[PDB]
Amino acid sequence: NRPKTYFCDYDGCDKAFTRPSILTEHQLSVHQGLRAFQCDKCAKSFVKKSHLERHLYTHSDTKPFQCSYCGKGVTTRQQLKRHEVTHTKSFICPEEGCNLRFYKHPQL
DNA sequence: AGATTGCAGCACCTGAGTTTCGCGTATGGTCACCCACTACACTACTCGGTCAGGCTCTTACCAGCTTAACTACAGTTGATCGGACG
Ligand SMILES: [Zn+2]
Ligand SMILES: [Zn+2]
Ligand SMILES: [Zn+2]
Ligand SMILES: [Zn+2]
């Protein structure tokens, strides 16, 4: 919506941003080499609250997305969708007019 | 010097210029969520080479003979070869 009208000034940086706090998040993270959210359970650190929140689940068994078929736990919707698509007849015969459909790619 | 009258002084209701304000309307700004793309390391089924098993084909025969060619003996002549020349 609103136009990108805050330009990073550093040598060899191309980026422009919508609102000045975001330009500052970029500058402190990329160019100065500082981060604002530390893991309690390992050495790593993160640039956003949502990124530390994802990393915190990785230290735990009670992972926040749970499979509808097998009940395996995962941390975000992309992982869930890819995993659940393995519980489907995903693959299709690529050859002309052939009707068949398959569950594991080596079968196809 | 009184009957007629104006000045103008008192008080209280009122009006605008000026101000402060509330909202619309709309605009830049915070920040929280969750999505897309990327990617190092991984999961797992198939293909592929190799091997055995054991069923399978096809050979060619023994000494002799009897149909078939070689395989040695044998003689004057080549032209690379040694090793020395230019
Ligand atoms: Zn930059
Ligand atoms: Zn950690
Ligand atoms: Zn599952
Ligand atoms: Zn097919």
From Swiss-Prot:
Q: Where are the zinc fingers (C2H2-type)?
A: 6-31, 37-59, 65-87, 91-108
Protein localization: Nucleus
Q: Which residues cross the membrane?
A: none
Q: What else is known?
A: Present with 1380 molecules/cell in log phase SD medium.
Per the entry, what this protein does is:
Interacts with the internal control region (ICR) of approximately 50 bases within the 5S RNA genes, is required for correct transcription of these genes by RNA polymerase III. Also binds the transcribed 5S RNA's.
Q: By what name is this protein known?
A: Transcription factor IIIA
What species does this protein belong to?
Saccharomyces cerevisiae (strain ATCC 204508 / S288c) (Baker's yeast)
- In the UniProt record, the gene name given for this protein reads PZF1
Q: Where the shown chain sits in the full protein?
A: 44 to 151 of 429
